[PDB]
């Protein structure tokens, strides 16, 4: 082989950040299960990977126990109760990307703290304070800024972080983004972490953190209120899954589109001898590119929050529907997207 996996006999963590990975490995070594370590990694990334690790965002967790039980945790943000259909349109009716990306109106009610506590309480074995402690120390005592963080602060952080006084106070230094080798201490985040560890997730959704989010919003024309934060909940949902050549594939259901379209595309590809074409062959890339077109077309029409709209997930993951798509794929002639519309699902409902 040219490329070699890392190998371990007992437990393993893979993450975007060396410090967070080592946090997770240490939790496993101390006796925590995979959920315990996953929550510790998620809290550590909220300190060491502020690009994306977070307390003020949201996401999804797929859990599969040793006994085969497979489940999904939806801790996607909820739009504020005051959010409206046309809130991002300018006076001419055209979407304003500044409003949906850089203003206080851009934020949904964060779900990460709720999601981690739902998973930890039901499927973990350690108390929240114990899985938050590594992150707390990293926030309180600091860590060295590496290449990844320095580069992201300079490239992406420069566009937003210095435009807010409280952000600039944390991530900027001497008029510049923190540089590689600098130490990043996050005392306010450490206090927030310490309060979650002591009082539990309600510190975020009903305590001092919730007040700080609500005031930040109320002071700057944002919409998240304390009612929003008190009403947030993470939701355990049934995974979306399929069968590909006798392998079973589990992924996230709505409000993610991911599981549906991964399963749909695999269903399409299953009709072709992918192994025979081989990686990097024009034939394999042709078939996959074409199959992907139909799924993203379906994505644009049928996918949304399942608590608000009925998602036809059965039809979309139906192998007969996938077969009707595979029969349209010409391995020698790509079909323009202008000739691709969302599929007719009625015969597959």
């Amino acid at each position: 082989d040219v490329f070699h996996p890392v190998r371990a006999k007992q437990g393993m963590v893979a993450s975007v950040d060396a410090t967070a990975t080592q946090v997770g490995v240490d939790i496993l070594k101390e006796g925590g299960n995979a959920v315990d370590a996953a929550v510790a990694v998620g809290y550590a990334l909220a300190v060491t990977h502020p690009q994306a690790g977070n307390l003020g965002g949201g996401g999804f967790m797929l859990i599969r126990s040793k006994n085969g039980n497979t489940t999904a945790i939806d801790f996607r943000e909820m739009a504020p109760a005051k959010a409206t259909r046309d809130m991002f349109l300018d006076d001419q009716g055209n979407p304003d990307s500044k409003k949906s990306l850089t203003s206080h109106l851009a934020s949904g009610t964060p779900g990460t703290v709720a999601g981690f506590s739902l998973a930890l309480d039901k499927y973990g074995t350690m108390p929240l304070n114990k899985v938050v402690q590594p992150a707390f120390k990293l926030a309180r005592d600091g860590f060295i800024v590496n290449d990844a963080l320095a580069d992201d602060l300079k490239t992406y952080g420069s566009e937003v972080l210095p435009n807010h006084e409280n952000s600039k106070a944390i991530f900027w230094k001497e008029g510049e983004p923190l540089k590689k080798g600098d130490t990043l201490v996050q005392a306010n985040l450490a206090k927030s972490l310490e309060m979650i560890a002591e009082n539990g997730p309600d510190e975020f959704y009903k305590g001092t953190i919730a007040e700080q989010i609500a005031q930040e919003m109320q002071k700057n024309g944002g919409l998240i209120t304390k009612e929003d934060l008190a009403a947030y909940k993470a939701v355990e949902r049934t995974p979306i899954s399929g069968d590909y050549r006798g392998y079973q594939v589990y992924s996230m259901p709505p409000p993610s589109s991911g599981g549906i379209h991964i399963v749909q595309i695999l269903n399409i590809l299953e009709n072709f001898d992918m192994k025979k074409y081989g990686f990097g062959s024009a034939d394999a890339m042709q078939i996959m590119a074409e199959a992907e077109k139909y799924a993203y077309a379906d994505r644009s029409e049928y996918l949304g929050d399942p608590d608000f709209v009925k998602v036809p997930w059965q039809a979309l993951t139906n192998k007969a529907y996938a077969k009707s798509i595979a029969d349209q794929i010409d391995i020698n002639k790509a079909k323009p997207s202008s000739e691709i519309r969302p599929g007719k699902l009625a015969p597959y409902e």
């Binding site: 070699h4 975007v16 995979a34 959010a83 055209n94 934020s107 949904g108 985040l189 589109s257």
Partner: protein
């Protein structure tokens, strides 16, 4: 967005993808909390038929609404082989999450690649709109010539994704890989 994967000594597995949406989200810290605020609301469809920051489009199903969860592309994924957890994977990439994770699955099952081989292999992506076959560096010019002759509109663009993956061998041994596209990451165990 960032993805991580965990497998413990008992064979329990977890895959987490979570995010502020864009890098640092809004860049707005909430007061004296030290917590950066997401810009997840851009994952709604702001107006039917108008693309968001990832080129994704929508209509009524993914319109903004009160208390609604905006549609995500995040795909923490577990593949089962012979009844057992076999591949744990996932990735950031907005719209490209679906195809990046897809390629991890295809690479593992169809091409028999080990988890590091599957991770380091180049990636391509087509999301209907815009109508272009997005590719990374690393595909043969001979192969790219055939695709354009087939009618694909090949577009060389930025590297896609950051898979963080664990494969479980039959004996219960663990194999992992971090993405070459991301520096300062780590897969480690004991």
């Amino acid at each position: 967005t960032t993805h991580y994967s965990v497998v413990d000594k008992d064979g329990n597995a977890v895959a987490v993808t979570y995010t502020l949406n864009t890098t640092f989200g809004t860049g707005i810290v909430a007061g004296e909390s030290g917590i950066l605020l997401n810009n997840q609301m851009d994952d709604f469809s702001a107006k039917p038929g108008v693309p968001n920051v990832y080129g994704l489009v929508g209509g009524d199903a993914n319109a903004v609404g009160p208390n609604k969860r905006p549609l995500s592309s995040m795909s923490p994924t577990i593949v089962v082989k012979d009844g057992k957890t076999w591949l744990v994977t996932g990735s950031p990439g907005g719209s490209r999450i679906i195809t990046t994770v897809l390629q991890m699955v295809v690479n593992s099952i169809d091409y028999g690649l080990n988890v590091a081989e599957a991770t380091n292999a180049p990636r391509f992506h087509h999301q209907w709109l815009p109508d272009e076959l997005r590719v990374e560096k690393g595909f043969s010019p001979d192969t790219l010539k055939l695709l354009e002759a087939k009618g694909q509109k090949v577009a060389l663009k930025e590297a896609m994704g950051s898979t963080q993956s664990i494969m479980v061998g039959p004996d219960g041994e663990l194999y992992g890989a971090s993405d070459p596209r991301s520096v300062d990451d780590l897969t480690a165990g004991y």
